Design a protein around this nucleic acid. Structure first.
Ligand SMILES: [Ca+2]
Ligand SMILES: [Mg+2]
Ligand SMILES: [Mg+2]
Ligand SMILES: [Mg+2]
Length: 326
DNA sequence: CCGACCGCGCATCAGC
DNA sequence: GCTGATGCGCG
DNA sequence: GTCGG
């Protein structure tokens, strides 16, 4: 947190551009600058110093000078004062409400938690669950609780079929002491890039977890991706644990390494890595890495036997998960 | 300058 | 019903 | 908003 004041300001700018301006490229610009600054091992003394980092340009450097000088940013002070902007920023904190819906609700005079509660009829299923657990979803998950959650998911999955393999990814795999949610990567030998030998592979796991009352709500669900809600069991006489977000992704077994690279993140790391891939003449998704032809069209999937193979193709030294928290 | 900025699953809607 | 676009979300 | 060519 050497430069926490600066990274916080940039993150707030990023969110404004995403949520209010709907300017996704500016959102990404601010996030990139925040990330490069967060990893910079010196306390920043000037905008000039910051501008030497990639992703920090003239405008952000000027903002950093203002912030260092006064401890604030006039641009943000004004944004905080603005009713429409503040309302839109708030509503987007509900899962399922993005920039477009938030502005639509604000138009219709729905702009507070109270307003949402009285207008449940205007929400879709995802938004209604997001509102229901608004408080809980803002809380972080102590790694101690992530470990208990891991034990439950891994054991319940084993009970369904011993051939499943469940891997907890995201911030947890990066070694974080707390996580925003739980991300589970699932494989089964019956599901590969070549064939699907059993139907309902994801379904059966989701069903078992609902049966033991671990999964409590569903935000969205398909053949390969589940997004929903879960909760640890609590003991006699004790307060219940908060409800938590859970994501489950079923990946073809022979594409596990690309899948775990993707699902481990961070999100900014993934964007950085994929961009570099392109520069090197490859394209990366959660399934494969493929060479780009002279025309720029993706060729056939390259052989991958480890996460490190992917790094090797794009000529990056291997980075352990704990070093991917960008 | 300026285009180029990752990549994709699921839900919802418009148009047919 | 299907296809395509869009919104939202995952990392 | 940034920056590579
Ligand atoms: Ca996230
Ligand atoms: Mg996560
Ligand atoms: Mg996340
Ligand atoms: Mg997640």
């Amino acid at each position: 947190t050497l430069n926490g004041g600066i990274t916080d300001m940039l993150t707030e700018l990023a969110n404004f551009e995403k949520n209010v301006s709907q300017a996704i490229h500016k959102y990404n610009a601010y996030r990139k600058a925040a990330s490069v600054i967060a990893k910079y091992p010196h306390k920043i003394k000037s905008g000039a110093e910051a501008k030497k980092l990639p992703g920090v340009g003239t405008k952000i450097a000027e903002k950093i000078d203002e912030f260092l000088a006064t401890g604030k940013l006039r641009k943000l002070e004004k944004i905080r004062q603005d009713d429409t902007s503040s309302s839109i920023n708030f509503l987007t904190r509900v899962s399922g409400i993005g920039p477009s819906a938030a502005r639509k609700f604000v138009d219709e005079g729905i702009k507070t938690l109270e307003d949402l509660r009285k207008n449940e009829d205007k929400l879709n299923h995802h938004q209604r669950i997001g509102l229901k657990y608004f408080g809980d979803f803002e809380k972080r998950i102590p790694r101690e609780e992530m470990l208990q959650m891991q034990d439950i998911v891994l054991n319940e999955v084993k009970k369904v079929d011993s051939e499943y393999i469940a891997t907890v990814c995201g911030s947890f795999r990066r070694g974080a002491e707390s996580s925003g949610d739980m991300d589970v990567l699932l494989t089964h030998p019956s599901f590969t890039s070549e064939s699907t030998k059993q139907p309902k592979l994801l379904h059966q796991v989701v069903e078992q977890l609902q049966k033991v009352h671990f999964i409590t709500d569903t935000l969205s669900k398909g053949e390969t991706k589940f997004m929903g809600v879960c909760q640890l069991p609590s003991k006699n006489d004790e307060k219940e644990y908060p409800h938590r977000r859970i994501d489950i992704r079923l990946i073809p077994k022979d594409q596990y390494y690309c899948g775990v690279l993707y699902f481990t993140g961070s999100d900014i790391f993934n964007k950085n890595m994929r961009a570099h891939a392109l520069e090197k003449g490859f394209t990366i998704n959660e399934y494969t890495i493929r060479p780009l032809g002279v025309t720029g069209v993706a060729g056939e999937p390259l052989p991958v036997d480890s996460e490190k193979d992917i790094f090797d193709y794009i000529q990056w030294k291997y980075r352990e998960p704990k070093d991917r928290s960008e």
